[PDB]
Amino acid sequence: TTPTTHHLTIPPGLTQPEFQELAHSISEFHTYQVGPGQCSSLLAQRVHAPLPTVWSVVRRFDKPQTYKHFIKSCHVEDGFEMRVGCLRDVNVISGLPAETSTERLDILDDERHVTGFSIIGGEHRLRNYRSVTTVHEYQNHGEIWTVVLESYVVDMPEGNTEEDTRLFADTVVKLNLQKLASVTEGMARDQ
Amino acid sequence: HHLTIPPGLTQPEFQELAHSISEFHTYQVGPGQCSSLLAQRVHAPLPTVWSVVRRFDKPQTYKHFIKSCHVEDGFEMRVGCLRDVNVISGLPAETSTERLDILDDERHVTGFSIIGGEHRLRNYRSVTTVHEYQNHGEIWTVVLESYVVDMPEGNTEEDTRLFADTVVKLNLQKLASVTEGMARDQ
Ligand SMILES: CC1=CC(=O)CC(C)(C)[C@@]1(O)/C=C/C(C)=C\C(=O)O
Ligand SMILES: CC1=CC(=O)CC(C)(C)[C@@]1(O)/C=C/C(C)=C\C(=O)O
């Protein structure tokens, strides 16, 4: 039941001035109860596109393939809509052939720009994976840009280290953030 | 392989490189094997790209999923040199011993093979070349990276290349990013 002393160290991807405005956001959405057989992390990605552009992409639970790599396809239900509890099936691109991922939408607030999900089924090391992602705007005496924060807590596999598990998860997440920043800086530049 | 332009290349570029593909990116692939060629155009000078592509000891400088790369103590950056690589994936136990096969600093060609280690995709062989291209002014580099890999039992030719293609395109993106950033910072 131990917390996650998280808002005390800069995530790479964030200058110090930005890590100030987000102290409260990090403590509110990106701190977890991790202690027994679990690990967690927070990653940051600076996007140079308007915040509504970013959130319009970030919010689509049904098209994660739009900003994450390694997704052959995502299937939602016909009787589904963009709401907490809706389920999506993800076909993964990996070394094995029949690798799917059943994920449940846990959070989705179109006014605080908060979203999050959990992995409820499918074959993988990352067991009991749960993620929260928030979107923030920044205005540095002038330019104005978005900041995306993504955190997770995940059951560390047995025999697999804490580092090797976060190290992998960090990389997956960092690269999707890079992808989102590009898809969205690409809608923005053309405006 | 020439039955499709590599994604990342227009036709004017696939023409100038036909000879280079046939000379360096063609493989002896039969059943239980698959091969692909990816292209990434980098907007940095060719010596800038090549200086990074050629470091057989620092693959992490342009590749994802690398916890650490170890060379030999007597690092002769030479054909036959070995590098032992820990990969970040589904376990802390994904290893790869890799041999340097080719290295022509004159043709800007390098290449390696995976000779040992634990992973599903065994007998991986890859080549990388670098080229300069010029369409109506603007000179840019083109990086071609090809491979052949023994496809596992139960994994289709699509499902295997789809995965291997992804890693390569992504390492290609990173290299374009590292080198265009070296160019801009100079
Ligand atoms: C790449 C991959 C491999 C696995 O073994 C688990 C799972 C299939 C869930 C995953 O898609 C992981 C996705 C993660 C960590 C984050 C996301 O999607 O934002
Ligand atoms: C990380 C990993 C996982 C696999 O399943 C295949 C293999 C073991 C070959 C690999 O090292 C892939 C290496 C690739 C694609 C390129 C390289 O090294 O330039």
Tell me the DSSP string of B131-181.
EEEESSS-EEEEEEEEEEEPPPTT--HHHHHHHHHHHHHHHHHHHHHHHHH
Residue B118 at interface with chain A, using a CB cutoff of 8 Å: no
Which domains, and CATH codes, for chain B? 11-184 (3.30.530.20)
**What's the half-sphere exposure (Cβ side, CA atoms, 13 Å) at A180?**
30
Residue B68 at interface with chain A, using a CB cutoff of 8 Å: no
The set of residues, in sequence order, having a beta carbon less than 8 Å from that of B153 and lying 6+ positions away, is B32
Q: Which of B52, B119, B166 to mutate for ligand 2's pocket (most ligand atoms within 8 Å of CB)?
A: B119
The length of chain A in residues reads 191
Assess contact for A159 and A149: CB atoms under 8 A. Answer: no
A-to-B residue pairs, Cβ atoms closer than 8 angstroms:
48
A75 vs A36: CA distance, rounded Å:
33
CA quadruple B128, B177, B60, A148: dihedral sign: negative
Assess contact for B96 and B117: CB atoms under 8 A. Answer: yes
Kindly list the distances between the CA atom of residue B77 and the CA atoms of B55, B132, B134, B147, B179, in Å, as whole numbers in the listed order.
8, 25, 31, 22, 21
B32 vs B152: CA distance, rounded Å:
7
Buried b or exposed e, range A26-61, using 16+ CB within 10 angstroms: beebbbbebeeebbbbbbbbebebbbebbbebbbeb
A174 vs A187: CA distance, rounded Å:
20
CA quadruple B73, B76, B77, B79: dihedral sign: negative
Query: How determined?
Result: X-ray
Structure tokens at A65: 């393939």
In angstroms, what is the span from residue A124 Cα to ligand 1's centroid? 8
- Give backbone dihedrals phi and psi of A84, rounded to 5 degrees, phi first: -55, 125
Closest residue, chain B, to A97 (C-alpha): B155
Strands (E), chain B: 34-42, 66-70, 82-87, 95-104, 109-116, 125-134, 139-149
Strand ordering across the sheet containing B66-70: B34-42, B139-149, B125-134, B109-116, B95-104, B82-87, B66-70
Q: Which long-range contacts (CB under 8 A, 24 or more apart) does A91-97 make?
A: A92/A124, A93/A69, A93/B162, A93/B163, A93/B166, A94/A70, A94/B90, A94/B163, A95/B90, A95/B119, A95/B120, A95/B121, A95/B152, A95/B155, A95/B163, A96/A123, A96/B120, A96/B152, A96/B155, A97/B154, A97/B155, A97/B156, A97/B159
Kindly list the distances between the CA atom of residue B2 and the CA atoms of A188, B5, B12, B20, B30, in Å, as whole numbers in the listed order.
36, 7, 14, 11, 17
